[PDB]
Symmetry: C3
Subunit: 36 residues, 3 copies
């Protein structure tokens, strides 16, 4: 249905933003190893 797709998309957006933060967190740890 229509509303279930609205929510699916909102959930998808929040998952991608959480994965962007995890990526930023990993990049910080990598840069420490690469320059520390």
């Amino acid at each position: 249905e229509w509303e279930a797709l609205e929510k699916k998309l909102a959930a998808a957006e929040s998952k991608c933003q959480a994965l962007e933060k995890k990526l930023q967190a990993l990049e910080k740890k990598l840069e420490a190893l690469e320059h520390g």
Copy 2:
């Protein structure tokens, strides 16, 4: 159209879950370098 958007979203969901697994795989390799 409507159905093409249903599928687009399903495809988007599966890509994000695959990227989450790749992220977990990279985090494991990073943690080995950081603590090994």
Copy 3:
């Protein structure tokens, strides 16, 4: 509305593809540390 959801989804797709590239970029740096 309907069109705002069309665009939301397109924006979501492009964010995930940008995060895939960042992931590939990080994986390359990790592999250098792991094998260099």
